[model samples]
Target: SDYVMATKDGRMILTDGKPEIDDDTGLVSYHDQQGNAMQINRDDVSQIIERLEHH
Candidate 1:
């Protein structure tokens, strides 16, 4: 439950929960807890980083 994603529009997404694929939209969807509860398309994502293995 540790995925950090960023967008090109200066949007920073840090989720403490797991993100799952929606029905058919294909966008990364999840009920964000302790972070931002938002949605976005995969094509618009600038970068994605996984920090679950960090110290």
Candidate 2:
């Protein structure tokens, strides 16, 4: 299974990885297919929903 998330600015990010919340920073952590990590501010998130894909 996989999912996609978009930012308020219309930036899209895709992942089949994992999601995490940092207790200290309070930022949402998203990992790409490469396992590289990136942080997004909670308020900056426009939506975080599932994307349906066809193979």
Candidate 3:
């Protein structure tokens, strides 16, 4: 089970669950397909939704 979050800049972030927002920094945390942890500001996110794998 994985999800995808699109950024305002048109970048896609992949994660296993909903991104966690930092109350202090307003940054959202996400992981890539390789599970590498990364952060992006909430303002940079354009969309968030589950990624459906058709297989």
Candidate 4:
């Protein structure tokens, strides 16, 4: 499993990964630790722990 870095202002530019959005519930899905994409309700997410990359 790899960590993905995302910003705070809703601009999540993930590297070698993809974000999925459910049209029915407007929920967002992303690849889990198991490499399977899981959908979570947008309302349930109050905060995000952004990952920092060090070059």
Question: Which numbered prediction scores highest in lDDT against the true structure?
Answer: 3
Clashing pairs in 4: none
Off by over 4 Å in 2: 21-24, 52-55
| TM-score for each predicted model, relative to the true structure | 0.54, 0.66, 0.67, 0.49
lDDT of 3 at 47: 80
Candidates ranked by TM-score, best first?
3, 2, 1, 4
Candidate 3, residues 1-55, lDDT tens digits: the string is 5678889998876676678778699898977668688888889988888766678
User: Which residue pairs of candidate 1 clash?
Assistant: none
Per-residue lDDT for 1-55 in model 2, tens only?
4667777888887866556656588688988888788888966777677755688
lDDT of each: 0.68, 0.74, 0.79, 0.53
Clashes of each: 0, 0, 0, 0
| Colliding pairs, model 3 | none
Candidate with maximal TM-score: 3
- CA lDDT of 27 in candidate 3? 92
Q: Model 1: per-residue lDDT, tens digit, 12-54?
A: 8777666654648858764566566666776667766676674
- Which model, 2 or 4, shows the larger lDDT? 2
lDDT of 2 at 16: 61
Candidate 1, after superposition: displacement of residue 39 in Å? Answer: 3.2
- Superposed by TM-score, candidate 2 places the C-alpha of residue 48 at a distance from the truth, in angstroms, of 1.1
What are the root-mean-square deviations of the candidates from the true structure over C-alphas?
3.2, 2.8, 2.7, 7.1
After superposition, the stretches of candidate 4 with alpha carbons farther than 4 Å from their true spots are 1-24
